[model samples]
Target: DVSFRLSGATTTSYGVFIKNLREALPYERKVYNIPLLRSSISGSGRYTLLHLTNYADETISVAVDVTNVYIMGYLAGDVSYFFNEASATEAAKFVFKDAKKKVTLPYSGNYERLQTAAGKIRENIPLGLPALDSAITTLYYYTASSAASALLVLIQSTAESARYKFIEQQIGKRVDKTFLPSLATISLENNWSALSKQIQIASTNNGQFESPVVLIDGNNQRVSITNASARVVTSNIALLLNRNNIA
Candidate 1:
């Protein structure tokens, strides 16, 4: 449970909060002066009877007199996951020490704003985008298409708009050259948005690689890797792969 607090909040509220949320010893007593509990404990006591009975296989008496702590938006972040000496030589937590109170990335209250932005770009603008690129820009991973509808992303705004674009404005099978033509059909003056695309159907190269690439495996063997299954690899992985090219 991540609790958030802003300045001017009574400090003791969190003091009481963490005590309730976090794991602690067998007990604690609220208070008596006012009914801090469902049924206040009746006692010979009056005014303010702070009862802190350290009755336990434990000891933290009268309990500390509470305390104090930030929110220059000085955010404190932490994620708890299991760990051990197993990763002793492993990297320690990454903390931005001495980081300023103000963060650079502002909160995006409504991210779906980007969606209609794209929708307008495709439907009205003079830029041209190709088949795969446009659908992905609409979403990620899964392409929006006729046979399968693309899922609505938080980045996108409307359900009506997502359905229209993903299913209605999409192109057909990846390999067919018509993919480009289909894009032109959907695009107004807007976007012109890869591949042997055919390699997936047959590797005759009948139109070859977009080129040939190789991998030097740990065994020091010259291993031939396929652009076949390769899509978007990291830039460094790409440079390493391209550098090892049998091209």
Candidate 2:
């Protein structure tokens, strides 16, 4: 049974977080209160309260790693609830220092919007889901057909329209000549529109209206949107496999 009470200034919310420890672990169990010193009360069962002035415009960071420790604290009116929650997750309590506030990290939000977006993309897009279904079904049919031609056209068609350009390039390089005739069966103009259609379809299926879920950032380099639709193609491929009983 252990109890620890800690507090900090509101201008910065100077606080300490509690951590757990292992008696024989090599890594030391540590506690930190932003911009301040730590006070310890010595004993198996001990209690301590720490405080300081809050004058800075930032929140403080607190971190602790312990095996079985408990802590409690009150938040000052000045601190943001998000930062306060982050601080609590880092430790069990809060500590303060003289007037300086520690920087607080941002919070990651819920993905309700992401799920809704994916559902919409699926609803609007035909190829990503249906085309994938067609491709897999074609592959199965080709496996037993007298024409027995590999669905190279289907693969190329899917590749050229992939939202990610790399997937298009990869299909071009990875596909063999044996499948070229199947690709030739589809018109070039149709191919171009099909891919854009793939993006739009995939987007609608996933509730996204953006092109290239990944795009170049300020540095002129690729950055991913980090949303559910970002991986729609890959996920749908997995679904295709599961649907067709592919290992």
Candidate 3:
């Protein structure tokens, strides 16, 4: 009894429409349309999405590298409290703080001297390794100092000016000039934007005034740390500190 009723019109009117519809097309002709258009549309979107993903990934990686350097700088200083975790998320905030510190310097006076002293302070820091030298140099410009002699010694020791020239030589003007600006812009537009409004204002204010500490002309504005020069500065400062423990 359950198998009984299956009722619909498979009947005469449906047969008439099927036959008439078949007559509307040529039976003998073959319809050839390009299948590649659909594929092309899908492929292009896929490629674009892949490229966008790749770019975002690379940005995150580069920011992480920069943040690590910033963390090292912050940890070396008294405000290590800001980055006790050393996690990338915390490290990014530490970097902004460091950046703000650098911006606080006055435009007048021998600013380079202060930057150099900061470098020196970092140099003698007993962190026990020289791998952090570059990071320390990056930090020195952010802090303030009272003694000009102290700064000169530090700048001369680490050779901050030389590092700039080295970087310049490694990367041409066109690339280096563009890179710093792009980093600053992207930081403001995306990453730095997410911070508290007060922090945002601080970062922006400091960013506008902060200048590169390194003097990268062809001449040696500060001491050189090449194989030959390294001996002189290291000999003078090495006894006071323990670079041997760092490695």
Candidate 4:
């Protein structure tokens, strides 16, 4: 139950007529208190009021025509990423309008090259004898005996530590100390002999080990290490050994 007073001046050909009206309004009166005035011949001027309402207390939306509106500038609250106009156009060429917002451009060629190089050298330079086996084989032509001797010494040192621990345990228990044969020591000695024999055979047969190798530069570019000049190979190998905490 509501009421509204609409009072305004209206001009008529008969005379200047001032009208004051109190109207009983409907339950949904959106623009009831506003006055509408017009002047025309034959008393044909009239005003109409269209009321729109939502009964459920939800938001009522009114859409006005924006065809004549021009957008000059826009501000984004949160921007995650952006791309150049060329990249945006390139992506839009293949994607549909609905999917344009979701499309992500792939990395450029140089970035892909860097990723590949990083993957190749991501592992730390390997340590100890077995880890350097491939490098030993590759450099066998010049330093087979020295590499073999170094590997045998590392094995002997490990065996000596284990033998000392076993001797200490037996002495601590007051057990009858049996002479512990140097089994691991003997095995490593035999391994060195076998390696030497194999090196000899390979040398005689002119056999060569071929494998692809690359070193990553500061820029993550792959520089060829396999079949490289002697100076380049030696320098990179030294660098790798130093990085691995090996002399």
Candidate 5:
């Protein structure tokens, strides 16, 4: 929905202008346009119309980082088109008559010749698109793999902090002053080992259970845990069981 004017320094040619404009935008933004043409009769069905419309949309969002430029142009006569760099290398000419050229620009270097005298181009560049939602979603899914790694670190840190604090509290309440340090150290390792064993037992039981175990309370409502939530609940139950056994 944002708008910006291209300075006169911007190329007048359609393809080059689009390529340059795309380069000027942020990496995630894509540009597209809509064109409307009107014609009036001058003589004997001969039409005199100044036809020019290029509406462009570039999607800008946090989750997506890509750009696609669409090129649409109309030419009403016999004309030849080639890039300056290509033309410089050859004496042969490639020409087309009564032509309409439409292409999607994948890279700026792909089409660089629409700025020639034979090029009659009219287009507008807008700053957003309706189809960009799918693209953004795709990008989000692509980044989820990395996000999963960070989540793993967070989950482990939380579990470790909880485990250490629980052990420290249990030691303070039960150990004598002279043996406090040694008992605390010994208790932490034992609690951790017990917790690990309980987790393994829970995991094996769950794996053997063909279907998900659903618990129904007095309310007769059904609840179930899946995947990571199931693992977390299993670990918590194991920790509680181990603590009670120690007590």
Candidate 6:
């Protein structure tokens, strides 16, 4: 058993340290030894020991309330492909080629205009989206293949790093202030790492996300969907996606 501790603050919290939270009688221990994973807001922060071990399917849970939670465990050092990013250039490199289009403009947030333009000239690639702005910017018109080709290049290059920069940034406006776990690389075994810092728990109330574009996770060529919310609650905890699919 790894000795663990929690240090920070929270109004209330329900935490669990277990390998498989889905099993009946899932592991829960009065906040994992109040000394090891408990933060005391009532007095000086309560902390004594820290523990970590490597095991596949290692998972933790925290409900509504939160405090600074820290751990040292195996983290896959690679797995860096995000949606728009590696998909854009990578899939292109495989199926087609880029014109290496370059552009430098005194750009504001309105850059959304040109991004779709990249999706545009690769025409009929996006399935049912039509190009709405062929207006020549209300200023002039580029009237040839050379004209359109270079224009497409500009937007493509600008968009290459656009999705990356946006996802890595937040409201405070700085770069690389996020930790989005990699999802592409094969996880053949333990993705190990050493001394890591505190982790915080959260779930946004204002918005939600949903993308049913099904994809598989393991060698089974079968994907299971789990409700991120279901993983946190004490009761009614269940697997949203599991079992065999007809696929």
Cα error, residue 206 of model 4, in Å, equals 9.0
Better of 1 and 4 by lDDT: 4
Task: State residue 129's C-alpha deviation in candidate 3, in Å.
Answer: 14
What tens digits encode model 3's per-residue C-alpha lDDT throughout 1-247?
Answer: 0000002212232233223322221222211110011111121121110000111121001111210011111222223222123343333443434532322222212334334544533223222112122223333333344323322322222222111222222212221121221222112212211121222222336422122112112232332222212222222111110112121
TM-score against native, each model: 0.15, 0.15, 0.17, 0.14, 0.15, 0.17
Among these predictions, the greatest lDDT belongs to 2
Candidate 2 structure quality by residue, lDDT tens digits, 1-247: 1111112211111111111111211212221100111123223222222121122322222122111111222123233111225323443233422213332323211122222323322213222222333433433233323111112223233322222233333233322121221211222212232323334334436544344344433344555443334333332211110111111
Tens-digit per-residue lDDT, 1-247, candidate 1: 1221212223343233233322121112211110011111122111110111111211101101010000001112221111122211121122222334312212211213223423432233221112222322322222223101111121111111111222122221221222222232232111100111223222344323443444333344554434434331211111111111112
* Candidate ordering by lDDT (highest first): 2, 5, 3, 4, 1, 6
User: For residues 134-186, could you state the per-residue lDDT of candidate 6 as single tens digits?
Assistant: 21121012232232332332222111111122111111121112111222111
lDDT of 4 at 190: 25
Residue runs of model 3 more than 4 Å from their true location after superposition? 1-103, 106-148, 160-247
User: Who is ahead in TM-score, 2 or 4?
Assistant: 2
Clashing pairs in 3: 117-151, 120-154, 128-246, 129-246
User: Model 6 — which ten-residue stretch has the worst lDDT?
Assistant: 190-199
Backbone clashes in model 4, listed as residue pairs: none
Give the winner by lDDT: 1 or 5.
Answer: 5
Cα RMSD for candidate 3?
30.1
Each candidate: what lDDT? 0.21, 0.25, 0.23, 0.22, 0.25, 0.19
lDDT of 5: 0.25
Give stretches of model 1 more than 4 Å off.
Answer: 1-114, 118-121, 128-196, 205-247
Q: Candidate 5's residue-wise lDDT over 185-230, tens digit each?
A: 2333334434333333445464332333443322445545332234
